[PDB]
């Protein structure tokens, strides 16, 4: 099994617990990815089949190891290179929402055509129009693993996370030390490179500030996440069964900010209603209403239910058929 891949994170990561799944199973899982990626895909027990790009273009490279003939291709929807490939099974992953021939990602040839298989990387609940899609796609949730020294107090934990979106607003760090500095909330936020923390006046005591934190296992101690609505970090959001408050920036994500918001999960705050006071009014909102977070308990249980990549795995090995 070979699977090819665009190289970006949110793509490569929830393929990964499935390649060890994969691997644990007795099947070889070759990788097309570059070097950036290729420490994470072997860790795993993938096979790094390293490539070059200019990060539309050309799969020449992945034609070059032709010689060893992959047996089924698994190809993220958006790496249509893998498509293109000799009379071989092949099995789309969406890392986003799926599509189909009533719901399509746009807001302005026939390589588009849904697969006999399409495993996505959410709860069938989350997918918009969920209700037309049929037996093709396989919805299995996030796709996890299977940890670091977070103790914390009584008190309520917040997350503050904006990942790779807003990369030149470190206002947005400002104003929410502002936001939450003298509240009960213990706060963790992780700025990136956006801005350097020890270049801040006076980090409040009930604040830590990060470039980078184990989402996941923050999360699982978290009682609020204010997110930027990326695909993985709202799906581990429900996973972990956490509130949100979400800001996007991108257009998939400003989807997934009206998704969180239409089902009843948390608050979708638009960049350019940001302020200190409608930060904290959304904080209020969100984690004082109980049937809100019910609302999270049961998309938490939908996430569960999905069967994540073991059930991904499977679905993979029952195609095997033509």
């Avoid at 996370?161 to 607003?169: C, M, P, Q, V």
């Avoid at 959304?282 to 049961?298: I, M, P, T």
């Amino acid at each position: 099994i070979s699977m090819i891949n665009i190289p970006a994170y949110g793509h490569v990561n929830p393929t990964l617990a499935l390649v060890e799944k994969l691997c644990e199973k007795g099947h070889r899982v070759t990788y097309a990815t570059t070097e950036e990626f290729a420490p994470a895909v072997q860790q795993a027990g993938g096979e790094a089949l390293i490539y070059h790009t200019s990060l539309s273009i050309l799969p020449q490279l992945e034609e070059l190891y032709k010689d060893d003939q992959p047996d089924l291709i698994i190809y993220d929807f958006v790496a249509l290179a893998g498509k293109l490939f000799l009379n071989v099974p092949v099995i789309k992953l969406c890392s986003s929402y799926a599509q189909n021939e009533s719901f399509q990602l746009g807001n302005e040839e026939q390589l588009a055509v849904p697969e006999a298989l399409n495993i996505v990387f959410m709860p069938k609940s989350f997918q918009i129009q969920h209700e037309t899609f049929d037996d093709r796609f396989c919805f299995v949730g996030p796709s996890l693993g299977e940890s670091l020294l977070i103790d914390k107090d009584d008190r309520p934990l917040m997350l503050i996370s904006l990942g790779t979106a807003f990369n030149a607003w470190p206002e947005f760090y400002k104003m929410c030390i502002k936001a939450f500095r003298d509240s009960s909330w213990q706060v963790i936020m992780s700025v990136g490179k956006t801005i350097d923390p020890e270049s801040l006046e006076d980090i409040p005591a009930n604040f830590t500030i990060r470039q980078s934190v184990p989402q996941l296992e923050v999360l699982e101690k978290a009682d609020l996440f204010i997110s930027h609505g990326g695909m993985n970090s709202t799906m581990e959001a429900m996973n972990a069964g956490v509130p949100l408050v979400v800001i996007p920036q991108m257009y998939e994500q400003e989807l997934t900010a009206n998704r969180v918001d239409e089902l009843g999960l948390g608050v979708y705050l638009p960049k350019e209603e940001v302020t200190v006071s409608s930060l904290q009014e959304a904080v209020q909102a969100v984690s004082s209403d109980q049937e809100l977070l019910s609302r999270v308990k049961n998309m938490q249980k939908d996430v569960k239910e999905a069967g994540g990549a073991e059930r991904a795995a499977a679905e993979i090995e029952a195609f095997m058929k033509k």
